[PDB]
Amino acid sequence: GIVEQCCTSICSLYQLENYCN
Amino acid sequence: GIVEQCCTSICSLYQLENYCN
Amino acid sequence: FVNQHLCXSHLVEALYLVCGERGFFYTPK
Amino acid sequence: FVNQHLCXSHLVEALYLVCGERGFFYTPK
Ligand SMILES: [Cl-]
Ligand SMILES: [Cl-]
């Protein structure tokens, strides 16, 4: 999930926005 | 919601925990 | 740190610290 | 600020900044 995508690997705007309400 | 409870008024542990998964 | 007026990033910080490994939802509306 | 490794509070900060008035869910598992 987010940690794998954005901490252990490099984040993106695309993915962050998937977690906005 | 949270802003009314914890910013405009004084927060509590009780209420913060209501927003934990 | 929790029994005070917590706004914006300050509120999100407290949710993060209280919730730990569970995480949380932040729904300001 | 978003196209890098963001961990713990740093990750929550970026969600907060990107999401703005919508808020977000932080589900580290
Ligand atoms: Cl603590
Ligand atoms: Cl911005």
Swiss-Prot record, chains A, B:
It comes from the Eukaryota. Disulfide bonds join C6-C11. This is Insulin A chain. It comes from Homo sapiens. The lineage of its organism: Eukaryota, Metazoa, Chordata, Craniata, Vertebrata. The gene is INS. The chain holds residues 90 to 110 of 110 of the full protein.
